[PDB]
Amino acid sequence: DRINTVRGPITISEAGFTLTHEHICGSSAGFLRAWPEFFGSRKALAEKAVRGLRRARAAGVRTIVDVSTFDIGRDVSLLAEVSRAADVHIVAATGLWFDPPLSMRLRSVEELTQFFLREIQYGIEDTGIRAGIIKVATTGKATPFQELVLKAAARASLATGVPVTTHTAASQRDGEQQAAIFESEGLSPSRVCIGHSDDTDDLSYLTALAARGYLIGLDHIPHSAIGLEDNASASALLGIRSWQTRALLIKALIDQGYMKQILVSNDWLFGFSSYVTNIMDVMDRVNPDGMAFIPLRVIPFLREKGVPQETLAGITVTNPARFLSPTLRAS
Amino acid sequence: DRINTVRGPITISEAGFTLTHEHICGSSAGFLRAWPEFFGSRKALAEKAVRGLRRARAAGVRTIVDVSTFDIGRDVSLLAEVSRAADVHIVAATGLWFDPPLSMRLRSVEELTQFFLREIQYGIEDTGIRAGIIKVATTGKATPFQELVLKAAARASLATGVPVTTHTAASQRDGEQQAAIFESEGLSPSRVCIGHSDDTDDLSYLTALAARGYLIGLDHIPHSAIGLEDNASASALLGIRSWQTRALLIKALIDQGYMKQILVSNDWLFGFSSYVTNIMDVMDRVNPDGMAFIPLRVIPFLREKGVPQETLAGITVTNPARFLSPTLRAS
Numbered sequence: 001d002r003i004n005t006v007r008g009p010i011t012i013s014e015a016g017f018t019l020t021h022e023h024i025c026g027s028s029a030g031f032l033r034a035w036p037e038f039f040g041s042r043k044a045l046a047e048k049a050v051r052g053l054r055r056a057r058a059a060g061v062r063t064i065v066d067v068s069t070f071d072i073g074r075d076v077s078l079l080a081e082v083s084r085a086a087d088v089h090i091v092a093a094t095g096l097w098f099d100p101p102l103s104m105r106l107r108s109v110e111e112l113t114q115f116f117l118r119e120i121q122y123g124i125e126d127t128g129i130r131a132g133i134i135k136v137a138t139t140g141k142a143t144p145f146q147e148l149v150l151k152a153a154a155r156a157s158l159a160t161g162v163p164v165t166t167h168t169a170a171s172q173r174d175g176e177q178q179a180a181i182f183e184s185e186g187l188s189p190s191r192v193c194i195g196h197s198d199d200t201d202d203l204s205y206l207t208a209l210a211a212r213g214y215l216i217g218l219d220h221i222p223h224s225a226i227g228l229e230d231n232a233s234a235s236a237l238l239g240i241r242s243w244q245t246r247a248l249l250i251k252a253l254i255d256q257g258y259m260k261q262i263l264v265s266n267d268w269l270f271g272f273s274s275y276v277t278n279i280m281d282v283m284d285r286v287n288p289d290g291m292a293f294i295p296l297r298v299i300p301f302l303r304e305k306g307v308p309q310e311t312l313a314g315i316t317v318t319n320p321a322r323f324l325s326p327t328l329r330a331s
Numbered sequence: 332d333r334i335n336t337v338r339g340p341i342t343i344s345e346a347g348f349t350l351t352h353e354h355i356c357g358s359s360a361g362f363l364r365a366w367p368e369f370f371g372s373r374k375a376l377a378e379k380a381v382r383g384l385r386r387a388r389a390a391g392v393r394t395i396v397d398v399s400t401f402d403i404g405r406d407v408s409l410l411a412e413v414s415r416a417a418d419v420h421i422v423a424a425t426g427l428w429f430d431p432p433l434s435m436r437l438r439s440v441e442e443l444t445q446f447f448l449r450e451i452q453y454g455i456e457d458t459g460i461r462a463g464i465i466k467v468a469t470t471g472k473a474t475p476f477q478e479l480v481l482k483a484a485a486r487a488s489l490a491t492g493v494p495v496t497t498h499t500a501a502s503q504r505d506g507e508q509q510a511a512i513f514e515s516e517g518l519s520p521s522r523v524c525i526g527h528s529d530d531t532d533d534l535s536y537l538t539a540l541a542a543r544g545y546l547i548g549l550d551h552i553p554h555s556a557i558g559l560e561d562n563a564s565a566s567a568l569l570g571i572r573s574w575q576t577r578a579l580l581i582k583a584l585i586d587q588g589y590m591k592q593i594l595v596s597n598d599w600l601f602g603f604s605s606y607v608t609n610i611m612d613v614m615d616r617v618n619p620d621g622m623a624f625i626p627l628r629v630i631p632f633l634r635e636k637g638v639p640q641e642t643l644a645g646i647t648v649t650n651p652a653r654f655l656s657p658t659l660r661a662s
């Protein structure tokens with residue numbers, strides 16, 4: 001009956017319109033604290049985040065799920081501060097992305113399980129802020145270490161009921177290998193969201209996963225380097241497909257009958273240090289709406305394409321609530 | 332005229348007997364704060380460190396140089412706490428070791444330079460604790476990023492006068508490439524310590540570097556897996572050469588006329604998460620004296636081999652003082 005947020009537990013109904021894959025800041029463990037000037041200042045980053053969150057809130061966003069793990073440099077204190085200042089619920093994550101340091105990479109599945117459990121059950125660092133989701137990632141075939149992470153994520157999810165969400169190389173069909181590893185641990189597909197799914201046009205891939213019970217994360221909607229074909233780093237990160245092309249995947253899935261398994265987001269951020277310098281500016285020019293892109297542009301676009309009101313509401317409110325609600329496997 | 336420590340500046344005379352390459356804890360950025368239970372607890376680690384530092388102090392150690400960088404998970408607050416409780420001076424480091432995260436790895440030489448300068452001139456994180464040394468590393472031929480780190484280290488050293496110390500794959504003669512890069516930036520060899528040098532039996536390589544003015548860090552004295560051949564991980568880390576064989580390299584360099592260019596240490600730690608679990612216990616069994624190994628066993632051993640009192644004092648007090656004193660290149 002409750003979802004853990006950076007301000008404490010909230011009831012399922014309080015979540016409302018939720019963005020399921022976002023970040024306050026895309027960084028590295030200890031980075032923000034050791035080099036805040038990279039972002040101007042910690043205060044500047046916080047203010048930027050508050051402005052963005054307030055604008056998203058004005059557009060109707062009630063909660064965002066910040067899928068920044070330890071290795072994405074998640075700073076829960078920052079999350080709590082901006083959450084309170086903007087009055088937007090923020091769900092924190094545990095798990096590991098694809099930049100774990102040696103202290104993490106050398107751990108066994110058992111040790112990692114304990115770490116994820118710590119962040120979900122007791123709290124992140126010494127804050128008492130409990131994670132409400134487990135984030136994992138692969139970028140093509142999983143590495144040996146990544147298989148361990150996925151297994152630990154499954155074990156933590158099974159013990160706590162908190163869902164798992166992933167980063168994939170959709171092109172490579174990462175989702176299939178992820179599902180395999182998760183199922184090998186007995187995890188229900190309904191507890192899993194296969195992320196960055198809109199990064200591919202393979203509808204066969206998406207649909208087959210959906211068919212198995214998985215949640216499909218169409219969270220890169222505004223990501224596009226069109227118009228910037230000349231910026232190599234940006235094209236590499238953002239792609240050359242339009243937001244409309246990506247958004248159309250939502251309707252496709254809906255048309256195929258999987259409206260209850262779709263999760264939509266922007267994968268936006270206010271700070272981004274784990275890539276080339278300046279990518280943040282580039283991205284903000286590409287999508288000035290930031291996190292508000294979904295409600296301001298995507299939802300209306302889908303409606304114009306014939307997606308009905310109730311389906312739109314189901315996807316943005318219902319689906320996130322069911323996913324986030326901690327749910328233990330029936331015995 | 333002053334060396335920066337975690338408790339503030341000290342005069343050159345206050346340094347006294349100094350261990351130039353040590354660590355309170357060998358970890359990863361953000362690791363200790365995110366998973367302190369890995370070390371039992373933060374308190375347990377601190378207590379262990381205080382006991383060890385107090386015993387080293389009893390044996391005559393007045394200062395240690397904690398060469399843990401951002402990526403070694405340096406927690407300056409921990410260092411300050413233990414320094415105060417044990418009453419041992421601790422010099423903190425900036426620089427980058429061999430496990431930098433993406434936020435660091437994608438940076439330019441200019442950016443890294445500013446980061447190192449920040450840590451030396453203004454302070455680490457928001458503490459005001461300023462670094463008194465710059466740490467860098469290679470493990471064989473430098474990677475492209477490592478070359479940048481080395482160049483940034485040289486620039487930071489040139490601007491501040493603080494020395495540079497390195498981690499090397501000694502048996503691969505990394506010191507030579509390191510020296511070439513440093514020199515290409517115009518840094519004086521006298522501001523540089525080529526570390527883990529006792530890991531090789533190639534005296535030619537060491538004397539040729541000494542001949543050029545570099546300091547030679549014979550900081551792995553107590554490291555040995557003799558008696559643990561059956562332990563692959565420990566063997567790989569510590570080697571099969573005895574402490575006496577490593578200590579004899581100190582005598583060899585003295586005999587070749589380089590007593591003013593030798594720095595001796597143990598490369599010890601109180602916690603170690605960046606390797607296999609349990610390596611700390613293994614290490615503590617190998618060398619129960621820990622940091623006190625140098626004054627309790629090595630010094631006497633050398634004396635017994637004929638090294639005079641004055642030479643021993645010069646290596647343990649004079650050399651470290653000269654190296655740590657911030658020294659700008661003459662105009």
Ligand SMILES: OCCc1ccccc1
Binds near residue numbers: 311318
């Ligand atoms: O019950 C059908 C309403 C609904 C539609 C889309 C997503 C979740 C719920």
Ligand SMILES: OCCc1ccccc1
Binds near residue numbers: 591642644649
């Ligand atoms: O003046 C000679 C004293 C000395 C001995 C060894 C190292 C540094 C100095």
Ligand code: NA
Binds near residue numbers: 160
């Ligand atoms: Na919980």
Ligand code: NA
Binds near residue numbers: 335461
């Ligand atoms: Na300084």
Ligand SMILES: [Zn+2]
Binds near residue numbers: 196
């Ligand atoms: Zn991602």
Ligand SMILES: [Zn+2]
Binds near residue numbers: 023
């Ligand atoms: Zn993301």
Ligand SMILES: [Zn+2]
Binds near residue numbers: 527
């Ligand atoms: Zn080292």
Ligand SMILES: [Zn+2]
Binds near residue numbers: 352353354398598
């Ligand atoms: Zn070391």
